[PDB]
C-alpha cells in the first residue's frame, strides 16, 4: 500500500481547498488526517465510511469522505480556511479505527508524503 | 473423513457487555458442507441479559460455510486441529465488539470457545434498550492477507420502528497449522432467531451461509 | 396466561408407509402469536426410513400461527381443552398420505399425537426413492364450515433434480369444546428442514406461519 | 394497547330496538375512530358505521342507514354505542367494534385495517 | 350445495357433445366431483372424476381417449364432460356427484357420494 | 387492443394492507404479461414486479420481496393484482400496471418496453 | 448551543390539492424557547393556488414551542439530527390533506422539508373556492405512544360568511435519535396571516404557541 | 392438389443451447388431413448432445394438424409459398429457447429451416443434466391477431424421477402471402418420442395433432 496525496497549495482565508489521499491488496483500510507546524489529528473515516470524527478545532469547516468507485482513497473537503490551517497535511492508513489509536501517528502504518497548504 | 457431512458442534462464551458478564453455554449441528447449521444457546450466568442478544447471536461457525469445488476451504482443512479468529465490530453510535474464539475438534464434534467484550454502547441505544430484531441477510468479503484469512462485512440491523443499526466487521482468521489459503471471494450469510423464551436466557438460532465468485 | 408468548410442545408419531411402520418422537418450542416454531425429530423405531422426509415434516402445529386482531385464533382458543385434526394429502402420482392428531395442554406444554397412514406411492417414484428436497412456500386457504375449521392447499414438493411434485391437501380441525369460528382466510406457510443426519433419524424443522385474509 | 369490551345484545322481535355498547380500558392517551362491524353465522364481517376520533364525521352502510345510529360518550373516553332500531331478521349476526387511530374511504370499511376488536355480542331477531 | 347439470341432447354417431355441472350455494369448499351414467333398468356405472383442485383426473375404461372431465377456472365446484367420438352405446342418463375428497375405494362408488345433479340424457342414434 | 383499467388506492397508514387491481378489457385474444410500476411525485417509473402471461413466473424488485405480491386473476382474462403488506411511508407513490406480450430479462423492468398501461393510481401511506 | 434563542428556518414544500400541483419555499425567523415564530412564504410553481391558503398554514415547527421546567422537550432534544412528522387532516366534509416532513439543523439554522397531498375536497367547498379567513386558535393534546410523540387537534377554520369550517388533526412527531419522551400536556397556537397579496403567492405567517400542563 | 393426403417433409436445424452449437437433419412423412406424423431426426454436427433431447422436439410442423370442415386451416392455404413462425419458450427455472423457423414447398415436399437459441439454462437443471422423459400431452390455444395467427401453450415436461418441468410457449405463425386468418380454436397435441438410440443422436418421433373449438 502506498498513499500519494495532492490537491493543495497557497489559498487565501475563507477559500476552498480539497485534499485526496489515493491508495495504490485486498483490504479496505480506515484513513485518516493529519497536520504538522508534531503530527496533530485533524480527523478520520472507517475503513466502510460509517464513521467519521473530527478534531474539535476543524468541526464544521472540515469534511472527510470516501470515494464510492476508486478503492482506498477519501477527500478532506476544507472550507472557511483559517491562518492556524497553515501546515503540512499527512494522509494515513491503518486497518480498523479505535479511540485509543485514530489519533495518535504511532499507530498507523502506511503514511503519505503530505502536501503543504498555505492560507494567506 | 474428518469433516463429516452432518457435524455436532458445543460452544461456551464468556463475554461482558458495558461491564455486566454473563456466560452461555451452547449445543449445535449441521451440515458442512451445504453451509447450514442450528443451535441451541443458554444463558448460565449473568441472565437475564440487559442488552439485545442479535450482538451475540453472529458469535456462535465458518467451517459451516458450502463452498464450489474452486475455492478452497481454508477452515475446513484446518481440521483436526482447528483454527482461531478475532473480530471488531464497530457499531455506528460507538458500540465496540471484540470477540476471540479457539475452534477445535474433539470426539468426532467441534468445539467453540468464545470470549466477548462489548463497550460504549450508549444507554439509550437500541442495544441497550433491546430495539433490535434481527440481522438484515450480510455479505462476508473474504481475501487472503498476511498468511491468514481476513473478512469484511457491512452488517445492519433491524431497529423495532423498521429503521435500521449498522456495524462494521472485520474477522481474521488463522489456521492452527499452515493451510492452502483461498483467493478473493464472498460469503452471503443469512443469520435467523428461530426461537427464544421471554428473557432470552434460551435462544435457538439458524445460520445458512455459501461461498461465490466476485 | 394460557397460550403463553412462548410456549413448548412434545410430539410422538406413530405411522406406516407402504406397509413399512415407524415411530417418531420429538420435542418443540416457538412464539405462538408470532407464528414461528422450531422442532427436534427422532426416529426411535423402524429407522431408516426408505421414504422421503418431507412427507412427514407437515404433520409435526397450527397454534404456532400469526394472526391479525380481526381474525379470532380458533386453535388458539380451544385450549386448555385442545383441539384434533384430520387431513389427507393426495400427491400427483397417486401417493395418499392420511393423518389424525390429538393436541393438549399438559404441564403448560403442547402435547401432539399423531397417526400417518401413507399408501400408494411408486416403488420408482420421488418419495420412495428419497429424491425430494424440500417444501415450497404454500399458502392454505382455511374457512368455516360445520362447527369445524377446514384448510385447502395446493402444495408442491422441490425435487432433487429441479422438478416439481404436487399434492392437495385437505385438512379439518375441530376444538374438542365449542369455540367461535372465524371467516375466511390464508395462512402463509414456510417449513424448512435446518439440518438432519445422513439417515434423517434425527431431524430439525423450522416453521414460519402467517394468517391474512383472501 | 387497549381492550374493547361489549355487551347489550340478545335476541329480540322484529321491529324492536337494541342497544350496543362499546367499552374500552387501557392507559392509552389516544382518542380512537370506532367503527362497528357484523358477521352472519355464515359470512364475513361487514361494515355497518363508522365515527371518527373526534366525533366530527360518521359513515353507515346503506342497509342501515336511518335506521342505526352511532354516537360517542363525551364522558367516558373511546366509548361509543350502536342503537339498532326498526330491527329486521336480516340484521341476525355477530356485531364486533372496532377501533384505530384514523379514518379514512380506503380503510374504515375493511376489517383488517382496525388493530383492536371486541369480543363480539350475537344478535338474533326473530 | 346444489348440482345443475345440462348439455344433454340427441347426438349421432360421431358427434361430440359437452355436459356441465354447476353448482350453487355458500358453500367455502372445493368439491372432487364425479360423472356418473344411468341406462335404463341397470344402475348407476362410473364414467370420471376430477380431484378437489383439479390435479387429478381419472376415467373410466371405456371412455378413455374420447372423454374429458375438466374445472372451470372460473366458476367454482363447476365441472365439464366433455364427450368426443360419442357411440349408442354412450347412450345413458348422466349424473354429476361432488364429495370432499377421492379416495380408490369410493370415487367408483355412487353411494359414497353426498351431493348428486338431476341427471341429463344424452341419446346417440 | 388492450384498455387497462386499475383500481383499490387511496390513503392507509403505515403497516396496512392494500390490494391493487388492474381490470383489462378490449377485443384481443391473447394472454399478456403484466408488470407493476411505481413512480414518485418528481422519480421515473420504478419497477415494482411482473407476471408472466401463463402465471407461472413472477419478478420482484427487491425493495418489495416479502411484502408485495402480484397474482393473475384465473376467472378474468389479463386482469391482475398487487397485493401490498406491511406498507412504508417509502411506498407512497403512483402505481401502474402495464401489459406485453412477453416477458425478457432484458424489457420487463424499463418501463418504456410495454405497450399498453393503465390510468394510474394514488398510494399514500401516512 | 444548539437551539439557540433565536433561530432562523427555511421551508420547501412540494404539494398537490386536488390534482394541482404546487411547490412553495419560505423563509422564517422565531425565538424557539419562547413560542414566537415568524415567516415569508413564496409559491414558486403552480400559482396562484386555486385553494384556499389556510389549508396550507399549519404545515410550515413545533420546535418553537415555550415549554415549562417540568415537561421534557422531546423535538428541541432531537437536534442536531432533528425529527420527522406525518399528520393527516380530515375536514368535515370529506377533505383530506396527508402532510410529511422533515425536520434538521444546517449550519445553525433549522431545514423544513414537506410533501403534501390534499384531496377530495367539494368543488364549491369553502377550501376549493377560497371561502376562509384564518384559523381559531387551536389546543393540541400531546401524549406519547409507541415511542414517539402524538398529537391531537380539533381545529376550526372561520368562513367568509360567518360560519365555521371544522377538521380533524392528528399527528406523530419522531425523533431521528431516540431521546426522552415527555407525558400528556396541551400546546394552546394562534396561527395568523399577518400579510398577503391578491392571489396569496406572498403570504406572511405568525405563529405562537406554549405548552401547559392538563 | 397442392397439399396431398400423405406428404413427406425435410427439416434442417441449426441451434445452440447454453453455448452448445450443433447440427441436426432430419425426413418425416405423415398425413396431413389426419392429423399425423413421423419423422428421424440425426444430429448431423455437434454431437452428442449434452442436454435433453426433449426441448428440441416441438421445433421440428401444423400443417399436420387435423381439421374440422368449418375451420380454416391458415397454414395449408398458405402453401405453396408457404409460411414462417417464431417462438419463444421460456421455462420455470429461467431457461429460455427462442425459435425461428421457415415452411416452404418444393418438389411436392415440405422443407423446414429451423433456427434455436437456448440460454440460462442451470448447470444442474433437468434440461442439460437430461433429467426429462417426454411432453404431457397439452392444448394449443389459437387465435387471429395483427394480421397473424398466433398460438399460445403452458407445456409440461415429465422428469425421469417422477416430477414436471414447466414452460410457457407463445407462437407467431404468419403466411407469405395473405390467406384467410381462421377464428379462436384450440389444437390437442401429442408428441411422442418413438425410439432413439443410446445418446440421442438419432431419434424417432410421432405427433397427433388436432383442432377442435373453444
Known sequence: ?120 | AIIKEFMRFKVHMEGSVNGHEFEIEGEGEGRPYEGTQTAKLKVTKGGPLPFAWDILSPQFSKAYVKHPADIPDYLKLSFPEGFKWERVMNFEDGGVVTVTQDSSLQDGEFIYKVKLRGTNFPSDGPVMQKKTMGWEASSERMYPEDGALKGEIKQRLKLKDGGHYDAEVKTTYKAKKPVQLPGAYNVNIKLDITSHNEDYTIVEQYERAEGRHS
Open chain 1, 1 to 120: 500500500v502506498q498513499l500519494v496525496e495532492s490537491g493543495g497549495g497557497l489559498v487565501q482565508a475563507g477559500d476552498s481547498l480539497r485534499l485526496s489521499c489515493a491508495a495504490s491488496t485486498f483490504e479496505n483500510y480506515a484513513m485518516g488526517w493529519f497536520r504538522q507546524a508534531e503530527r496533530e489529528f485533524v480527523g478520520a473515516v472507517s475503513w466502510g465510511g460509517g464513521r467519521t470524527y473530527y478534531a474539535d478545532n476543524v468541526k464544521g469547516r472540515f469534511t472527510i469522505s470516501r470515494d464510492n468507485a476508486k478503492k482506498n482513497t477519501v477527500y478532506l473537503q476544507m472550507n472557511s480556511l483559517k491562518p492556524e490551517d497553515t501546515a503540512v497535511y499527512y494522509c494515513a492508513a491503518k486497518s480498523v479505527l479505535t479511540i485509543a489509536t485514530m489519533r495518535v501517528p504511532d499507530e498507523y502504518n502506511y503514511w503519505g508524503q503530505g502536501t503543504q497548504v498555505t492560507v494567506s
